[PDB]
Symmetry: C3
Subunit: 59 residues, 3 copies
């Protein structure tokens, strides 16, 4: 059929069940961004533990 | 001016080549969900391999 | 009270501000896909450093 009409608030919406649903809901954000941004956190520690990396190297 | 929407069965589709295309196809689905869910699997072994971590700690 | 129509060139767009916006922008692949595909690279070395894993195992 036809159903052209979506909200305009700068946000993004997808076509689902003849309804506008925030695409972000299909992305899986707010429930998996952890694994996406975790490496950024763990990397910090690993990146700092380099002190033992070089020391042992030039020990 | 306007284009026909897709069916209504709980699924979602995007605007591509004037046709309905499951967004999931754009997310890759299985084509990259592996690296997204791999750490969850490998973490398990690493997490259970802590037995040797504390061992050295408490000797 | 309707949607433009979106272009037809093989690309895809979502419903945003009453305009066609490449969903890919919401997937995340512009100055961050690195952290997404980095593990694939670093894994190579980690996967290769197994030489020391088995060596120490079988001495």
């Amino acid at each position: 059929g036809y159903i052209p009409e979506a909200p305009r608030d700068g946000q993004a919406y997808v076509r689902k069940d003849g309804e506008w649903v925030l695409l972000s809901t299909f992305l899986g954000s707010s429930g998996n961004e952890q694994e996406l941004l975790e490496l950024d956190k763990w990397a910090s520690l690993w990146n700092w533990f380099n002190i033992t990396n070089w020391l042992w190297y030039i020990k």
